[PDB]
Amino acid sequence: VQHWCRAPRPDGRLCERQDRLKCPFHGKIVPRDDEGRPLDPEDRAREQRRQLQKQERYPSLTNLKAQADTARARIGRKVFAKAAVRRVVAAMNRMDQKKHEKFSNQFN
Amino acid sequence: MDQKLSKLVEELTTSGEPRLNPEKMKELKKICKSSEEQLSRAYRLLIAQLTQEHAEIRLSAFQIVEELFVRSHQFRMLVVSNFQEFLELTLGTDPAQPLPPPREAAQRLRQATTRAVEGWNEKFGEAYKKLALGYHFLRHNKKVDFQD
Amino acid sequence: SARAAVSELMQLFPRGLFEDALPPIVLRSQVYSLVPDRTVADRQLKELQEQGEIRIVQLGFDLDAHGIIFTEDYRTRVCDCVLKACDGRPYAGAVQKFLASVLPACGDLSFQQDQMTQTFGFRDSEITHLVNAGVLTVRDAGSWWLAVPGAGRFIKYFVKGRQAVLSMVRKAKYRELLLSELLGRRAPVVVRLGLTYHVHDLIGAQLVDCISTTSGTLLRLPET
Numbered sequence: 001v002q003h004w005c006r007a008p009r010p011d012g013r014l015c016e017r018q019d020r021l022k023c024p025f026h027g028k029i030v031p032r033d034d035e036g037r038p039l040d041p042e043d044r045a046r047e048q049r050r051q052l053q054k055q056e057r058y059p060s061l062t063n064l065k066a067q068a069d070t071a072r073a074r075i076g077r078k079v080f081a082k083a084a085v086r087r088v089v090a091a092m093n094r095m096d097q098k099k100h101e102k103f104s105n106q107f108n
Numbered sequence: 109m110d111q112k113l114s115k116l117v118e119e120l121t122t123s124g125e126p127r128l129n130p131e132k133m134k135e136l137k138k139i140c141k142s143s144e145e146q147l148s149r150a151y152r153l154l155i156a157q158l159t160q161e162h163a164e165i166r167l168s169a170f171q172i173v174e175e176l177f178v179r180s181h182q183f184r185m186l187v188v189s190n191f192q193e194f195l196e197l198t199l200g201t202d203p204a205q206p207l208p209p210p211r212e213a214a215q216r217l218r219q220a221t222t223r224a225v226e227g228w229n230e231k232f233g234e235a236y237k238k239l240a241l242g243y244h245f246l247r248h249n250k251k252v253d254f255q256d
Numbered sequence: 257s258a259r260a261a262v263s264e265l266m267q268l269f270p271r272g273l274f275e276d277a278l279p280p281i282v283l284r285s286q287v288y289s290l291v292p293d294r295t296v297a298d299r300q301l302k303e304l305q306e307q308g309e310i311r312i313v314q315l316g317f318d319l320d321a322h323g324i325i326f327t328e329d330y331r332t333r334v335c336d337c338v339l340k341a342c343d344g345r346p347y348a349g350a351v352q353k354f355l356a357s358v359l360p361a362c363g364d365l366s367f368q369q370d371q372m373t374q375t376f377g378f379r380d381s382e383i384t385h386l387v388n389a390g391v392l393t394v395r396d397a398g399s400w401w402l403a404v405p406g407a408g409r410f411i412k413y414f415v416k417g418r419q420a421v422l423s424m425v426r427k428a429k430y431r432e433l434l435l436s437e438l439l440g441r442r443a444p445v446v447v448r449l450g451l452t453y454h455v456h457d458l459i460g461a462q463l464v465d466c467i468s469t470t471s472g473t474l475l476r477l478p479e480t
């Protein structure tokens with residue numbers, strides 16, 4: 001992993017992250033010079049366009065939707081779904097299938 | 109003069125205020141003292157609002173009812189007429205008709221109505237035999253903790 | 257008198273909605289609406305029914321649903337429509353015999369097998385002929401109610417209209433509403449028979465409380 005993210009950080013430092021493909025904090029990794037400008041002018045234009053797009057874009061009573069509208073509720077809905085638990089049980093049963101395969105030579 | 113009464117109770121209820129606004133409370137007091145059929149109209153407002161599904165709204169309605177009860181005499185006969193349904197909607201005695209959310213509002217309603225029933229038994233209980241019966245009925249058949 | 261009341265209510269019937277295939281129908285509960293003395297209403301309706309001017313038919317959608325129809329509207333519509341749509345198919349003659357023999361004789365609500373087999377010489381084949389005519393429907397084994405052909409359409413519209421009107425009263429404030437306000441209000445498309453018709457029915461069956469106020473008669477839902 002040789003090429004570095006090298007994007008201009010808000011602190012004036014260039015990123016030293018050694019990711020093969022993408023920077024988690026700067027999107028796709030493009031080759032940058034010692035001062036962080038991408039070598040390809042077209043890549044620089046695309047990055048500038050992406051940055052510009054990103055920059056552009058009974059009350060006194062409790063609302064039950066507050067609990068329903070939260071990350072934890074969403075995750076609980078996703079994981080505790082009948083389909084999801086069924087897939088989990090299937091995978092764990094295949095794990096059981098391997099520990100059933102732990103008797104090769106003998107009768108088992 | 110019916111529109112203004114409905115308006116005023118609408119602000120008092122829908123606001124969900126933890127405590128009643130005293131100025132419009134006094135306006136309601138004076139305007140209801142004006143007429144007795146209007147007092148019944150306010151009673152009907154309160155009953156209608158109590159059925160609506162929100163614990164805070166029910167708390168506001170019950171607080172208004174307690175104010176009128178302590179303040180008015182004819183209102184006492186009027187409410188003790190349907191004390192059965194009133195207890196049902198406030199105490200949630202029938203499990204088939206629980207108290208809506210939020211839970212904090214429901215608990216506050218429970219505590220406030222227990223205390224209000226106790227006070228009414230102390231004050232008007234002899235004056236309304238049905239109130240004494242209802243108190244006793246709560247205390248034994250439902251086993252409501254009056255010390256909570 | 258009940259006779260007037262049934263007359264005015266029969267006028268409210270929108271005959272065009274059923275393309276004049278169905279004779280106009282009035283529900284006994286609506287007769288109670290215009291005649292508050294429920295007992296006198298029932299006595300005078302029984303008087304009329306004995307005299308043979310009207311027929312009472314078990315509409316079935318509720319156990320207390322008895323539809324009231326002028327006998328002549330019944331005869332006219334049944335003869336016309338049934339014989340026209342059934343010219344040639346056999347039960348026309350059987351229905352003719354029925355209208356000629358039974359209806360003038362007994363105005364009874366139900367028909368039991370023994371009566372038609374003996375007093376009227378009707379056969380099983382002819383009874384099945386009637387049943388397919390729509391004129392009879394099965395109460396029990398060997399028992400049948402009188403019926404109007406095609407009543408299902410009216411029953412469906414009436415049921416949906418009643419529930420819609422009740423819902424409209426419910427959704428008004430307090431679950432209350434003034435009668436004039438309801439009548440003037442634009443009728444929902446579900447309510448196909450007209451609002452006065454359904455309002456009388458609701459008032460008569462004590463489904464809605466009629467409170468006479470200074471502004472008129474208010475409708476309130478009794479506390480359930």
Ligand SMILES: [Zn+2]
Nearest residue numbers: 005015017023
């Ligand atoms: Zn980076």
Ligand SMILES: [Zn+2]
Nearest residue numbers: 023024025026
């Ligand atoms: Zn980055």
